[PDB]
Amino acid sequence: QGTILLDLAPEDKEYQSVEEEMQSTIREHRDGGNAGGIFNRYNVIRIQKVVNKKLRERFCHRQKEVSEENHNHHNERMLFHGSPFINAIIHKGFDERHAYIGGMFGAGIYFAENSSKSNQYVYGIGGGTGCPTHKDRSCYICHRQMLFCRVTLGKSFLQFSTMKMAHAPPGHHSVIGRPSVNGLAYAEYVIYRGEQAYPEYLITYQIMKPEH
Numbered sequence: 369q370g371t372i373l374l375d376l377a378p379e380d381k382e383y384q385s386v387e388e389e390m391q392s393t394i395r396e397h398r399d400g401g402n403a404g405g406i407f408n409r410y411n412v413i414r415i416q417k418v419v420n421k422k423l424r425e426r427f428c429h430r431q432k433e434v435s436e437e438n439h440n441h442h443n444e445r446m447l448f449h450g451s452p453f454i455n456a457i458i459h460k461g462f463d464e465r466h467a468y469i470g471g472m473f474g475a476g477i478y479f480a481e482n483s484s485k486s487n488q489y490v491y492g493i494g495g496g497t498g499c500p501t502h503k504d505r506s507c508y509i510c511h512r513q514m515l516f517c518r519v520t521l522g523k524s525f526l527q528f529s530t531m532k533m534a535h536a537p538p539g540h541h542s543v544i545g546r547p548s549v550n551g552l553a554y555a556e557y558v559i560y561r562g563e564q565a566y567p568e569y570l571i572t573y574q575i576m577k578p579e580h
């Protein structure tokens with residue numbers, strides 16, 4: 369009836385694929401790590417596959433609607449997502465009704481191909497006030513969660529400057545905020561429909577305090 373979480377064996381390719389995509393997309397942000405914390409490695413505590421009959425159906429249906437409107441190419445893409453609402457997402461799915469309105473490209477659901485990018489949002493905008501128990505944005509003790517999702521982009525509208533949107537532009541299904549000299553440091557992917565993203569993997573982890 370609800371969401372089933374399947375544990376993945378660290379000895380299985382799927383677990384391995386996910387972890388590498390998460391560990392190898394770490395990058396230094398102009399932030400100095402104030403939002404997500406100072407680190408260059410994560411300690412993956414566990415990866416669970418999210419299974420929801422209903423979520424999958426709304427996702428797949430949305431998928432061929434998008435196809436009809438894009439030459440039969442849904443343009444699926446694996447992207448990371450970080451927010452203080454993961455437990456709600458894995459059970460009810462993404463919902464644009466609880467979307468970020470204070471964002472670069474409006475009221476959308478944001479994604480990033482860089483795990484360290486979503487990590488800055490796991491505890492709120494700018495990392496908020498940090499983890500729940502120690503109120504520390506760079507804490508290395510608490511378990512953080514993030515998602516590696518299937519995101520249907522269809523025909524994406526590409527833009528450089530910050531123009532607030534409420535839906536995708538006509539003929540499009542997503543907005544990609546592209547890197548600018550005076551703008552973004554890395555790409556962000558936006559969708560204005562929850563059913564365009566499926567929360568495939570639940571990743572529990574800790575950021576790791578550096579070495580030399």
Ligand SMILES: COc1ccccc1NC(=O)c1ccc(NC(=O)CCc2nc3ccccc3c(=O)[nH]2)cc1
Pocket residue numbers: 448449450451453456457460461462463464466467468476477478479480485486487489555556557562
């Ligand atoms: C209360 O929330 C819910 C309850 C039931 C079902 C769904 C939800 N909420 C959501 O789906 C949801 C969806 C999106 C957000 N917020 C965001 O997308 C912004 C946080 C964020 N921003 C980014 C910007 C650039 C690159 C990556 C990110 C990112 O990972 N997260 C917060 C909540």
Ligand SMILES: [Zn+2]
Pocket residue numbers: 499500501502503504507508509510
């Ligand atoms: Zn903590």
